Every structure is written in C-alpha cells, then in structure tokens.
C-alpha cells in the first residue's frame, strides 16, 4: 500500500515563507499527480494546486497563483509546498494528497481522485508568541449532577490536551474546541458533571498538557 | 471555474435510514469526473466514490454514487453509527479542481433540554487582571441554542465567544460553552451577572445567574 508522511507542525510569522514536505512510501511516485489541499479550522476543504512529478507540469488555484509554489523531487520521492507571504488567514491544516490507481506501477490506469492522504500539517500563522496556558479552576457552585471544570486560558499555539484525574475520569467529560481571542491567544474549557454527593470525597484534578510550549499543569478543582 | 454546491447543509437522519446527498454543478462536469469523500473529525478525508459512480476497493458497498452532467448524488442505503461525519464532493475533470462546502450527517434524537450552569471568574484570574464568566450548556439536541449575556439586566454584546462540541458518540447531544471576557475594573462596576438560554426543549428561556462576590 501507499502512504504519505508530511513534515511536522510549525509556527511562522506574518510575511515569512513556509515550506512543508511530503514523502511517499510504497508504490510509484513519478507518474501519479500529487496535489495539496488545505483546511481552515471548522471550514471546508480547499484546493491549492497539483503537479505530475515526471513532467513538472504545475497547476495552481487562481487564489494562490501568486504566493504558492509546488514541486516534486524524484530523487527522494518527496513533494514540497512552499507558501510565500503568510498572513493570519493562512492558518490551516495542509494535506498532501495523491490520486489512486488500478494496478501498481507505471501502468496502473490512474483514477484522478485523491485516494491517498497524508497525516496533515498544522501551519499556524500569527504574530503572537508561544506562551504556556494559564489553568484556572471552574469550581462547582456551592448551591445530583453538579458541574465543575477548568478554564485553560491564554496560550499559543494549538493544540492542548486535557485529561481528568490523570485519565481515571472519562464519563461526563466535555473538552470544548478552542476559540481564538482578540489577543491572538487561544482559550478553551474542560467541564465534567459528577454527583453532587460526591463533591466532598473525590479529588478532581484536570491535567493540561501543551505540547508546543512544553507546559503541563495539574490543577485541583474544589468547592469554594 | 466550476463551482460545486452541495445540498443540503446539515442532515438529520436516524441510524438505519437512507441518506441521499446532492451535489449541483455550475456547469457540465466533463467526462463525468465527480468524486465523493468522507471526512470524520480529526482525520484526513477518505475517498468514497470516484468517477461519479465507481467505488474504490476496501470501501463498504453501502455507499453508491449516481447522476451525471450537473446533477450528482451520493447514496448511503443504510446509515450505520460510523458514517455520521462530513461529506465533500470534488470535480476533477478540468485543469482547476474544486471541492464542495461539505454536508454534515448527524444523528437525530428526541430533543433534549440543555443542562445550564454558570461559573464566576476565579480568584486567581481576578488577581491576574482579567475576568471571565463561563456559561455551560450540557448535553442538548438539536444544536440550535442561543445564549444571551446579561450584566445588570443589560444585553452585553461584542465580547463573549462560544464553542460547541462535536455530536457525542453515545447520546448524540451537543454541548455549548460561552465565555464572557471583561477586565477587572469593568467586572467590579456591576453586581448582577446572568446568562439567558433559549432552546427548543425549553418552553421558556432559562436564565441562570449570580451576584458578584456573594
Ligand atoms: C517504479 C516507480 O518508481 P520511481 O522511482 O517513481 O521511478 C522513477 C525512476 O525513473 C524509475 O527508475 O517504476 C517501475 O516499477 C516501472
């Protein structure tokens, strides 16, 4: 089977140029069209462009016809997407795709449709600075099914992984999608509902892990 | 440019029901090259149908594409709990390729009134300079729920952001979170902080509130 492994997520400043890779494993590479498709958070799929590695025929989407540059190195079986002049509206997940086939190698009647996708590459474009999140307690109201939680406020960039009781709590747990504040920093909330008779016996701590800023906070939430 | 318009927007069907998704073309898709992809949350899209009707190997035979020219249709004969995700259509018969905007297929349940909670800002957050009130809408259906922020009985607007969880894999209910953000000075000038929630399951709007510091 064929698989495409892209480069890791990266954070760029507005104006600077980014370069994402995509290496092909299995099957051929030279004779099947390789395209790039990005997806903004919560939005739909959007075509950027494509290239057939053998002929070096580049086809760009008109919206990107100025700032995009897609190539394919046959010596490493690796495709490269280079986006110039980045700006806040370029923050998305960039996928490398390739059309499927009916039979393996240089023959194999190509189908055209993107049947082979990468793992995606998160490219965040903002003029903010990588900051660890502040974890505040959302204490259960003193007045079963009571709701408690933790507010993970002001961090950059995405994502943040939140667990409960180091993982020994999954029932009734809701971790909301992060909202982008006007400061340029993200913020989310992780809530959980537990019996009201279990507020003064069980210890509820939320574990916030933020990979990019290398920060981990284990905050204990208790009634006020 | 060929612009593809999918219909309908969102889809409310039950597990076992017949799902019919429509894709309308701006102009005749040359050589009948329309493709249907499925995308779950968090993962890269998967090819369901290619060449408008042909199905790749490994794909369950419950998916089937039909139609030609400008009208195309993706059909799931029997919806099963797994296939509830987002579906995109993409034309690739021209030099330029374009996708649709997607069609979310959700689980339909017997409407649930939201469990409303409200949290005043933390003592630590106040000692940091900023205040944030959090209104929680726990487990409800359908998604259509409106949250209005009321400080001292005044419809606050401009601030406060909201986020809705993906449809739960167990009870198929959405959960909303609204976060009113103010500064400490602006937070301390007032006493009554309230959040008003309107939803189908609620006959009358539910207003959960507190007073600052009590
Ligand atoms: C394998 C495809 O591998 P590639 O590295 O993409 O081929 C490019 C070279 O020019 C082939 O030697 O081709 C054959 O089996 C036919």
> Are B1 and A114 within 8 A, CB to CB?
no
Residues B2 and B95 occupy one common structural domain = yes
Second CATH level (architecture) for the domain A124-224: Sandwich (2.60)
> Are A114 and B122 within 8 A, CB to CB?
no
Q: Which fold has domain A1-123?
A: Immunoglobulin-like (2.60.40)
Instruction: Return the H-helix or E-strand segment holding B124.
Output: helix B123-126
| Last residue of one domain, picked from the residues B79, B109, B139 | B109
Q: How many other CB atoms are found less than 10 A from the CB of residue A73?
A: 13
Residues B104 and B121 occupy one common structural domain = no
Residues B47 and B138 occupy one common structural domain = no
Experimental determination approach used:
X-ray
Identify the bridge partners of residue A68 per DSSP, sorted by sequence position: A83
Ligand 1 atom nearest the C-alpha of A53 is: 6
Residues B40 and B50 occupy one common structural domain = yes
Domain ranges of chain A: 1-123, 124-224
Residues B102 and B115 occupy one common structural domain = no
| Residue B138 touches chain A, beta carbons under 8 Å | yes
Residues B1 and B93 occupy one common structural domain = yes
Q: Strand B103-107 relative to strand B10-13: parallel, antiparallel, unpaired? A: parallel
> Are A45 and B99 within 8 A, CB to CB?
yes
Q: For residues B67 and B16, is the Cβ–Cβ distance under 8 A?
A: no
Size of interface A-B (CB pairs under 8 A): 127
Instruction: Measure the CA dihedral A122/A126/A131/A132, to 10°.
Output: -40
Chain B residues within an 8 Å CB radius of A50 = 97
Distance CA A92, CA A63 (A): 15
Residue B125 sits at the vertex; the CA angle it makes with B122 and B129, to the nearest 5 degrees, is 140
Q: Strand A10-12 relative to strand A121-125: parallel, antiparallel, unpaired? A: parallel
Resolution (A): 4.0
């Amino acid at each position: 089977q064929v698989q495409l492994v892209q480069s890791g997520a990266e954070v760029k400043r507005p104006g600077s140029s980014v370069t994402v890779s995509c290496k092909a494993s299995g099957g051929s590479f030279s004779t099947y069209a390789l395209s790039w498709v990005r997806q903004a958070p919560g939005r739909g799929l959007e075509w950027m462009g494509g290239v057939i590695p053998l002929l070096t025929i580049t086809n760009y989407a008109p919206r990107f016809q100025g700032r995009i540059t897609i190539t394919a190195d046959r010596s490493t079986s690796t495709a490269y997407l280079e986006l110039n002049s980045l700006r806040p509206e370029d923050t998305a997940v960039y996928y490398c795709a390739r059309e499927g086939t009916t039979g393996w190698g240089w023959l194999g009647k190509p189908i055209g449709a993107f049947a082979h996708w990468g793992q995606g590459t998160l490219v965040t474009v903002s003029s903010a600075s990588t900051k660890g999140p502040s974890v505040f307690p959302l204490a259960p109201s003193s007045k079963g099914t009571a709701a408690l939680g933790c507010l993970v406020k002001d961090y950059f960039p995405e994502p943040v992984t939140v667990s409960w009781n180091s993982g020994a709590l999954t029932s009734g747990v809701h971790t909301f999608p992060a909202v982008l504040q006007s400061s340029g920093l993200y913020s989310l909330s992780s809530v959980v509902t537990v019996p009201s008779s279990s507020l003064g016996t069980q210890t509820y701590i939320c574990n916030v892990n933020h990979k990019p800023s290398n920060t981990k906070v284990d905050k204990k939430v208790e009634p006020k | 440019e060929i612009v593809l318009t999918q219909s309908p927007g969102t889809q409310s069907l039950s597990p076992g029901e017949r799902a019919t998704l429509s894709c309308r073309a701006s102009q005749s898709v040359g050589n009948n090259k329309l493709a249907w992809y499925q995308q779950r949350p968090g993962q890269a899209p998967r090819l369901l149908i290619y060449g408008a009707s042909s199905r790749p190997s490994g794909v369950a035979d419950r998916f089937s594409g039909s139609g030609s020219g400008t009208d195309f249709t993706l059909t799931i004969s029997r919806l099963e709990p797994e296939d509830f995700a987002v579906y995109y259509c993409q034309q690739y018969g021209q030099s330029l390729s374009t996708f649709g905007q997607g069609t979310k297929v959700e689980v339909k349940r017997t409407v649930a009134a939201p469990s409303v909670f409200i949290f005043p800002p933390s003592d630590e957050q106040l000692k940091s300079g900023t205040a944030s009130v959090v209104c929680l809408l726990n487990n409800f259906y359908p998604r259509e729920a409106k949250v209005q922020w009321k400080v001292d009985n005044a419809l606050q607007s401009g601030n406060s952001q909201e986020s809705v969880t993906e449809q739960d894999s167990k009870d198929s209910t959405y959960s909303l979170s609204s976060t009113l953000t103010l500064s400490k000075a602006d937070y301390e000038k007032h006493k009554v902080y309230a959040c008003e929630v309107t939803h189908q399951g609620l006959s009358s709007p539910v207003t959960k509130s507190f007073n600052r510091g009590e």
